[PDB]
């Protein structure tokens, strides 16, 4: 419910949080399954809007 | 000033909203991809259309 309440601006800055956190590989690897569960649910839920966003910055961020 | 139409795609539960006021996640009909979290007063369900006066204000909780 916490992940569904937030709008798409907060989905975009959540993706910015994930993109910031998988450079610091001490707290990527100490929170891998939590990060995986939350990110996969977030883009699975906002997947209709996420793929219709058109910006190369978000495309490179996802990549 | 125009008005816009928005089809509900999720009835947001487990928000701590004021009674009688349910938060909701609507999408628009003119571009069928962008969404906004509103909060309605009536008895609302999924995929019913509601008429937003302005499209540029996400909703908070009420309490």
């Amino acid at each position: 419910d916490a992940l569904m309440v937030m709008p798409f601006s907060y989905v975009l800055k959540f993706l910015k949080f994930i993109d910031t956190v998988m450079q610091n590989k001490t707290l990527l690897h100490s929170h891998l399954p939590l990060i995986c569960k939350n990110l996969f649910f977030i883009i699975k839920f906002n997947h209709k809007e996420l793929v219709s966003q058109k910006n190369e910055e978000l495309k490179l961020q996802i990549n | 000033t125009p008005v816009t139409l928005a089809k509900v795609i999720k009835v947001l539960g487990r928000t701590g909203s004021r009674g009688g006021v349910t938060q909701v996640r609507v999408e628009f009909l003119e571009d069928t991809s962008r969404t906004i979290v509103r909060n309605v007063k009536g008895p609302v369900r999924e995929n019913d259309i509601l008429v937003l006066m302005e499209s540029e204000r996400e909703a908070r909780r009420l309490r």
Partner: peptide
């Protein structure tokens, strides 16, 4: 007090 979801949003 807030709850989860909006604590995550403000953080």
């Amino acid at each position: 007090s807030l709850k989860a979801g909006e604590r995550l949003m403000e953080a």
